[PDB]
């Protein structure tokens, strides 16, 4: 049948959502010494808040194969921050400290330009 599709790691959501939790634990117990080695100027508080935001955006997913990739890519993004392959700039590219706000209210977009 066409609907049947080969899996990646998990055969259903219940098994797939286990890895999200195991991945989350790795990140939560890695920020404090990530902020230490990289000598960042962000507290462990808002560092952990950032990981909360990243997961929360991929919360509407319902496909076990899509979730596996988002975990596989999540594990890679962690191996770079533990083996310090990333430099100080790469870790600070999540926090967007150099892009001016882009307001969402209609008037602000109307005043500035033609975009929606």
């Amino acid at each position: 049948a066409s609907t049947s599709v080969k899996p990646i790691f998990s055969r259903d959501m219940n098994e797939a959502k286990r890895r999200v939790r195991e991945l989350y634990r790795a990140w939560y117990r890695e920020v404090p010494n990530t902020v230490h080695l990289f000598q960042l100027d962000i507290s462990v508080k808002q560092g952990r808040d950032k990981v909360r935001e990243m997961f929360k955006k991929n919360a509407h997913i319902t496909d076990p194969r899509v979730v596996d990739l988002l975990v596989i890519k999540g594990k890679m993004e962690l191996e770079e921050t533990i083996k310090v392959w990333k430099q100080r700039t790469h870790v600070m590219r999540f926090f967007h400290e150099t892009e001016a706000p882009r307001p969402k209210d209609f008037l602000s977009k109307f005043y500035v330009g033609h975009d929606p």
Partner: protein, 88 residues
Amino acid sequence: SDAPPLTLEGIKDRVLYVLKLYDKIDPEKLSVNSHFMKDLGLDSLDQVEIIMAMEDEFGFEIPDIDAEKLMCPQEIVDYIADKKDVYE
């Protein structure tokens, strides 16, 4: 010495102590049989953070399969007692 045997009453004071120092939980409604998600209004990841917090004060690994069942402070206390062999 200075390491008395663990007790269920003793554990429940250690368990609740961590939950007190959690900015997302109101200490007034902490209770001891209050569910983390039914009434306290916590999301799934909040429970995971608590279980991780419970491990530092009780040094031992809680496998994720076990963490799926610990959803109230009493169950946390029962789980540790079921693991460290303290019955009283």
